[PDB]
Amino acid sequence: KIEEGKLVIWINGDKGYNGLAEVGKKFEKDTGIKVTVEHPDKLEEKFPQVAATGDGPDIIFWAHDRFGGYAQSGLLAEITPDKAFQDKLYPFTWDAVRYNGKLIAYPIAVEALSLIYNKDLLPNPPKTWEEIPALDKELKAKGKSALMFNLQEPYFTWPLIAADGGYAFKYENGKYDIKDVGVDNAGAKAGLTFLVDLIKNKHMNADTDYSIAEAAFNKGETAMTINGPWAWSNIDTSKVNYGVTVLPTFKGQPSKPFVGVLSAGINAASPNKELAKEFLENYLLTDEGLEAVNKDKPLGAVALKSYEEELAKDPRIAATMENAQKGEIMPNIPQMSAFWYAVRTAVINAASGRQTVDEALKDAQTRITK
Ligand SMILES: OC[C@H]1O[C@H](O[C@H]2[C@H](O)[C@@H](O)[C@@H](O)O[C@@H]2CO)[C@H](O)[C@@H](O)[C@@H]1O
């Protein structure tokens, strides 16, 4: 079970782990329990492995889609905030962290992808995916490109796949039907085809990853990128003149991002649960704790009503909420990990031209429902 009489936290590398570390600091200065903040690579993958052995962090932060699986494997402790503490948070955010009716984590923030554009190359962002090719044609003549975003992570591409009808698991009478998947239907096929055509026709490259896309927009070479709130910090730092807005429509329907609820879970294997709960509910989940974190890497829309209230007014935040509203909150069922790996292969194989769209989506469909 290990741990000690201290706190070890694991959070993804794209989040404000230094803001989080500033918050451990006044936990410790006010308590004697020192907090250690780490951001291992693949932590979402590494957790189940080391926690399974009874070790790992005291507290783990990830989007809520991974939590149903952790809970089913028994890796998380059931938390118990009272109705007063519960009351401070938006209720749709506690729903995201419920597995078989029990709460298995504290909801922190509401994440949705947005279109980010360079106001200096493109004062007015395109309203449609369909006018992007033309747009690229024009910029390219000027040594630039219309759009670049991470193609290696299915999370970035799902909004387009889902726009005209693709879907993960059908939500039917209080639960998700694991055998009803919409990764190979006509909307999903139209969506991926459109993407592959972008590449085919040299508007985009099959290899773009997170770093390539980020450096491109931050250096002024591409006019738009698609990313979450956590990327805003580096943009600010590069001083590009950027706007954040709704994603473009495809076939007249809104792009539909999967929405993630950034969440903090307690290792079932920790000796520190009480410490952990003090920290979360009394240090981090305050206006002050959230703001130390948000000044490091922006969180998006926060689940704490009080702070959220001050947060947006911010047009970046308003846009985040609008894309979120057109999207769908992810399922947290154990099957989310099969879905993601199947959809990850499919896109890469289709973008790389190793498989046709029809072949890629069909394999994915089979893989998921097996
Ligand atoms: O690409 C699949 C991946 O999508 C989501 O991960 C997001 C995460 O929610 C965001 O907070 C941000 O960090 O980036 C990730 C994509 O790189 C799922 O939460 C995750 O389970 C899934 O594997």
Side-chain angles (χ1 to χ4, degrees), residues 14 64 82 88 117 132 177 187 197 302 306 334 361:
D14 59 359
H64 68 101
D82 45 332
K88 285 188 244 209
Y117 61 104
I132 287 183
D177 184 342
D197 269 7
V302 293
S306 65
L361 295 171

Side-chain angles (χ1 to χ4, degrees), residues 12 14-15 62-63 65-66 111 153-156 230 340:
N12 207 38
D14 59 359
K15 317 303 217 292
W62 192 270
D65 65 309
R66 295 281 162 170
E111 302 184 349
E153 276 299 353
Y155 180 75
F156 289 95
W230 60 77
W340 287 132

